Each structure stands twice: as structure tokens, then as C-alpha cells.
Amino acid sequence: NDYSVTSTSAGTKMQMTQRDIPQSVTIVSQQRMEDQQLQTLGEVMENTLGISKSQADSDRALYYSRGFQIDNYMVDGIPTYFESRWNLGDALSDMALFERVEVVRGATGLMTGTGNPSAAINMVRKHATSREFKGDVSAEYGSWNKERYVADLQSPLTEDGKIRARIVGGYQNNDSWLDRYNSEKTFFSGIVDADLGDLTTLSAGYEYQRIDVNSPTWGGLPRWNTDGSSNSYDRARSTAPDWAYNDKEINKVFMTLKQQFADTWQATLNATHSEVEFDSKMMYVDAYVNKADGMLVGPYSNYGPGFDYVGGTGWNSGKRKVDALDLFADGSYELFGRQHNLMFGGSYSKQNNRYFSSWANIFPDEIGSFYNFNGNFPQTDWSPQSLAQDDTTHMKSLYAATRVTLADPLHLILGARYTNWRVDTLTYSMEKNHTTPYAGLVFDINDNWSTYASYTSIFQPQNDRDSSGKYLAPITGNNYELGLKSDWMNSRLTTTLAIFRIEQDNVAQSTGTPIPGSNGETAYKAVDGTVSKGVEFELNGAITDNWQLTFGATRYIAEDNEGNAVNPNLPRTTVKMFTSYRLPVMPELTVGGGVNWQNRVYTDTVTPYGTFRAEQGSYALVDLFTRYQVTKNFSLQGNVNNLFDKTYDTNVEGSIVYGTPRNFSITGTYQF
Ligand SMILES: CCCCCCCCO[C@@H]1O[C@H](CO)[C@@H](O)[C@H](O)[C@H]1O
Ligand SMILES: CCCCCCCCO[C@@H]1O[C@H](CO)[C@@H](O)[C@H](O)[C@H]1O
Ligand SMILES: CCCCCCCCO[C@@H]1O[C@H](CO)[C@@H](O)[C@H](O)[C@H]1O
Ligand SMILES: CCCCCCCCO[C@@H]1O[C@H](CO)[C@@H](O)[C@H](O)[C@H]1O
Ligand SMILES: CCCCCCCCO[C@@H]1O[C@H](CO)[C@@H](O)[C@H](O)[C@H]1O
């Protein structure tokens, strides 16, 4: 029921309160997710301070933090990596399966081997913890024929309550503001928690998710006319044909073993085998519009006659396999007459991604005037799919970190992760070894206020070679941070103020000279990359016993080596707040809502006719909720999203993608 979650293992791999973490940490609680109906990982991230989204199409969105892209999401500290163009729906993961989401902003190289200096996102699974049959079931009806049904049930399976089990299952069907769009999803997670004898705990489970989308969009609506004037469409407008579909199926097995070897020492072994399979047939439009006739003009027609295509069709299928295990120990040691905490462990991960494609380009004659276009396009007589990609990544790490007690109110965190990383591709192989250091310092001024200072890093390997022919050294994302954290009411209310600087280094830059003794391979030089700098402030917790409020604000600057704004489509200033208020005179009633505000964003498009700049001015989005506790078991929740019905663009960096219009939702819940 509390917005503030007391402790976390996030950032350092050591169990502590947020105050003791010398990094910017945000934790999204179960209650916040229930109040605002954050049902997907994507919805959690877009309502999280310092995280922004870019929606390429109806089901594909990418998430950014501090000017950089998040390239992996994790489940119980196990990460799964992805490429921008191969979106396996990881942000569509159903939240009903997870207790909470831990967000760490900056360089998270101690938690994971590779990545960008953006953010680590960790989804924590629901566990069977009650010693009594407990659960809840719910039915939700909303706008665009949405129906959502969820059951969460748990119980011990033995008289002593040593063996316990929890099952979460659900189904959702809905349409959209988009013409012909339909999504159907099934989700299910099962877990068995058994306390083996004394000092041993074992967890084992299975996760299944399936999302089938009909008429999903690919790309956006033509933003530009040949004369430079911009275009506007009804938010219901879709380029998705009736034969278009995207279907994905997720199957995972996972086990966690915890052993208490001695007083103050515990060993943990987390393992997972994950698989996702997808099949899709879709069509996209990517062109300018000739205002007089409505005819489309290709953005690459300058290259010649075979390059004037205005869209495409594609039949894409594939499979991702993840076999990963994390083994670590945490305990105490005494040096210089004082107790200090020590964490050490290892990681192994094997990730394979195999894709099949069949595709064709679309020319202006094939589609006709865009003014009469509504997905009414003939399906391609698909040729046989061919192996488009087959990649295997082996990531192996050894990591150690100690929290040193310099004095009672002063702690120094010193860590390092060494990583052996390898990729095997159809065209090449690359192996890289890197040591990522962690240095932090936390000073407790008094019982409620603390200051911190930290140096954190992460590395990103790159498929670029120098004049010698050797692969270029990986990109390092270095985060320098100073801040102030407060804790009140035994961590029930917390505040954080962070000032950061990110230096992305060893970024490949073309020399404009080919590699001697190669077939035109371009030679690259390692140079300083993106520099990002900003401030974050968040207040999270209970103001009073019946008033829970989360309030955040950020402002940052991100620029490349040249000095140009990196991703100008993402807001530099944002304010995200959400609140819950239970009436002291009527405690059966809880009211609330929230406001997400962002400043102006833009994107320049260099075309043949000149430079066209996309604009999206300042806007807020308002959500409201109310919950009435009818009986000790039954409650009714009503939610309104985008109350002022703001028309806004979620894809300023490309073709027009509209954001969610005003939507309503009624939910009945039976708890016990
Ligand atoms: C959609 C789910 C509706 C659940 C309605 C549950 C009604 C519970 O009903 C109770 O169940 C108990 C045993 O479980 C019995 O011991 C009680 O006598 C009975 O009143
Ligand atoms: C052992 C602990 C060492 C921690 C080193 C952290 C140094 C902080 O680094 C500083 O952070 C500022 C951002 O607030 C930047 O403006 C400064 O340029 C940067 O030097
Ligand atoms: C007590 C203050 C300690 C450092 C926190 C303030 C850091 C704010 O950031 C500062 O912004 C300035 C320009 O606005 C730059 O000149 C500084 O390099 C940069 O550190
Ligand atoms: C001392 C505690 C912080 C004081 C309030 C925050 C003011 C931070 O100052 C801001 O920091 C940014 C990041 O370095 C700079 O880019 C901005 O120019 C500067 O205004
Ligand atoms: C798939 C739908 C599952 C419905 C499960 C209903 C479980 C009811 O469970 C019962 O609920 C009663 C209160 O309603 C309590 O008296 C009992 O503790 C509990 O056993």
C-alpha cells in the first residue's frame, strides 16, 4: 500500500535502503501500479522520472535516460539485450507478474556487463509469501472495448507452511483509437517457494505470455508535404492493412536458491532459460506528400530510379534464447576494529537471436493518392523467407564490491566487474575483455539527511575497425554524480537530489580512408562521444498516513562531440507527479491522479527541398483515479487517462504517431 519501498539490492547488488546507495535510484511500488493502472513495463517506464519514450509504431517504443538508450531490461537481476529494429515486445511484459520495478539512472556497469549510461530496469517477480490462502481477482472494462481479467492466488501447500505456491493468470482483449487495431494477450506465472530444512530457501517457476496483435502499424503517418508544410490527421488514421499481424509467444523457466552458510553470510544462485518466438506480416509508409494529387514521394529518390519507394511490406519471424545464471555471496568481515560488508560473485549468459525475413518495397503507383489510403493495400505474394540474422552473445563476468565503514556516518563503496564478452554473427566475430570500476561515498549529516558522491561506468562493444584492422575498443559510459538524500518515518518518505555528468568515451568516428589490405572497409578512430549533464529531484512516500505522493522533476543537456543536441525529440525538462489520498472522514474512499509535464521538443529532417523541422510544443497529461471499498473484500476503481484529451506526437524523430486520447476505465476487485 505504500509508494515508498524500504530496501533494495539495486545498484550495488547489496541489500540496503535508498539513502545508502550512492546512485540515483527510483522504485515503482505495487500500489502506484494499481492506482495508475500501469499494466506493462512500458507504462511503468514512461511514468518514471528521467525516462522518456519514442514510439516508432503502435507496438514498438524505445526508452531513454539522461540522453542515452536503455538496451536491456532485467528480471531478478538477469538482463535480456535487444536492438532498436528487433523489438521482441519486452516493454509489453505484463506487470501482473511482478511485485515492483527497480530503476537505477546512470552507468550501471556493476549490475550488468554491457550497456549505455542510461538506466538499469529491474522487474522483481511476485513470490509465495503468505502462510494463508490469499489472493484477489479482478475485471476491468474500458474505452475501445478493453476487457481485462486477472487472478492472483497464493497459499502454503503443506501444514508447516514450508512449501508455498503463487499463481498469477490473466487475459486482455482490446481495440484502440487506431482503425482496425486489435490486441489479445494471455499471461500466466507459477512459482513454488520451499524452505529446505534450515538456512536454505528454493524458488522455482514458469512464465508464459502470448500477445497477438491484428493490424498493428509499421512506421507513422506522412508528416511532410513537398512544399515544406506539415500535415495533421485524425488520431484514428492507420496505414495498417487488414492482413497485417504481429504475434509473439514467451516461455520462461527460472529458479532461485538461497543458502545461509554462516552468521551474516548468504549465497544466491539465480538461473533462467527464456524463449520468445514471433511471426509478423506488416506494411509501412515512409514518404513526403505532393499536396495537389496526394501522391507519395520517396525520401531516397535522390539516389536514383530504383530508390523512389514510398513504403514496404515484410514477413518477419524469429526466436530468442537466453540461458543465464548469476551466483553471488554477501556477508561481513572486520578490518581496523570495524564491521564492513563484502559482496563477490559471477555471471554467465548465452543469448541467441535468429531471424527470418521476406520483404518488398512499395512504389508510388502501387499505393495511389494518400488521400484515399486506409490500409487497403494488396498482400505481397511472399517469396520464401531466408536467414536474415543469427547472432550468439556470450557474456561472462566476475564481480566484487565492498561497503567500507570509514566511520559510523561515513561509508565508501568500492567495486569492480570484469567481463569477457563475445558475439558470433553470420558475417563476423568479436571478443572483448573490460573491467568496470565502481567508487561511491555516502555521508550521513544527521538522522534524516545524507550526501553522496560516486563514479560509475559501463562499456558498450562496437562493430568498428581501425586502420590496423583490429576491432575498436568498447565505448565507456562514465557517470560522475553528487547528491543529497533524505529518509523519514523508517524510510516511509524519501527525497533525492542528484547532479550528474556523463562522459561517453572511445566512440568510433570514420577517418574517411579505407583499411589497408581490405575490401573498402572504412577505418575508424576512437574519439570522445556524447556529454550529458543535468539535475534530478524526487520526493517519494507518505506525507501523512492517508496521503501518498510521488513528485519528480528533471532538466538535462545532451550534446555530441560536434556540439549538437543528441535526440532533440526527447524533452530536456520534465515534471512527473502522482498522488493517492484516502479521506480521513471516509476511509473507504481514496481519490487521486497525476500530471506528466514536458517542455517543447523538435527534430530537423534534411530533405531534397530543404530542412523541415518537426515541432511538438509543451504539454501536460492528466490522469485521475477513485477507489471505493464497498466491503472488506470488494472494491470499485474508476480511472481517467489524458483528462484534457491532448493530441500529441510520440514520434517527433520520424513520421507522426499520436499519443493515447482520453480513456476511461472501471475495475471491480474481490480480495481475501
Ligand atoms: C469471483 C470470485 C468470487 C469469490 C466468492 C467467495 C465467497 C466465499 O464464501 C465463503 O467461502 C468459504 C470457503 O472458501 C466458506 O468457508 C464460507 O462459508 C463461505 O461463505
Ligand atoms: C570515492 C568517491 C569518488 C567520487 C567521485 C565523484 C566526483 C563527482 O564528479 C563531479 O560531478 C559533478 C556533477 O555533479 C560534475 O559537475 C563535475 O564535473 C564532476 O567532476
Ligand atoms: C556545492 C555545489 C557542488 C557542485 C554542485 C553544482 C554543480 C552544478 O553543475 C555546474 O554547472 C556549472 C554551469 O551551470 C558548470 O560551470 C559546472 O562545471 C558544473 O559542475
Ligand atoms: C547544491 C545542490 C544543487 C543545487 C540545485 C541544483 C542546481 C544545479 O545547477 C544546474 O546543474 C546542471 C547540471 O550540472 C547545469 O547544466 C545547469 O546549468 C545548472 O543550472
Ligand atoms: C478464479 C477465481 C478464484 C476465486 C477464489 C475465491 C476464494 C475465496 O476464499 C475465501 O474467501 C472468503 C472471503 O470471501 C474467506 O472467508 C476465506 O478466508 C477464503 O477461503
Author numbering: 58 to 729
What does the publication say?
Notably, all three hydroxamate groups of coprogen are coordinated by FhuE through two arginine residues (Arg117 and Arg142) and a tryptophan residue (Trp275). An additional hydrogen bond is observed between one of the keto O atoms of the coprogen diketopiperazine ring and an asparagine residue (Asn373), with the remainder of the binding pocket being composed of hydrophobic interactions [Fig. 3(b), Supplementary Fig. S5(b) and Supplementary Movie S1]. The planar nature of the FhuE binding pocket does not allow the coordination of the Fe-ferrichrome complex without significant clashes. The direct coordination via Arg142 of the hydroxamate groups appears to act as a selectivity filter, only allowing Fe-hydroxamate complexes in a planar configuration to be accommodated in the substrate-binding pocket [Figs. 3(b), 3(c) and 3(d)]. To determine the structural and biochemical basis for its selectivity and transport activity, we solved the crystal structure of FhuE in complex with coprogen. These data show that FhuE employs a selectivity filter in its substrate-binding site, making it specific for planar hydroxamate siderophores.
The TonB-dependent transporter FhuE is integrated in the outer membrane of Gram-negative bacteria and has been reported to scavenge these fungally produced coprogens. FhuE belongs to the TonB-dependent transporter (TBDT) family and has been shown to be both necessary and sufficient for the utilization of fungally produced coprogens by Escherichia coli and other Gram-negative bacteria. Using this tool, it is shown that while FhuE is highly active in the import of coprogens, it has some level of promiscuity, acting as a low-affinity transporter for related siderophores. To determine the molecular basis for the transport of both high-affinity and low-affinity substrates by FhuE, we solved the crystal structure of FhuE in complex with Fe-coprogen. The structure of FhuE consists of a canonical TBDT fold consisting of a 22-stranded transmembrane β-barrel, the lumen of which is occluded by a globular plug domain [Fig. 3(a)].
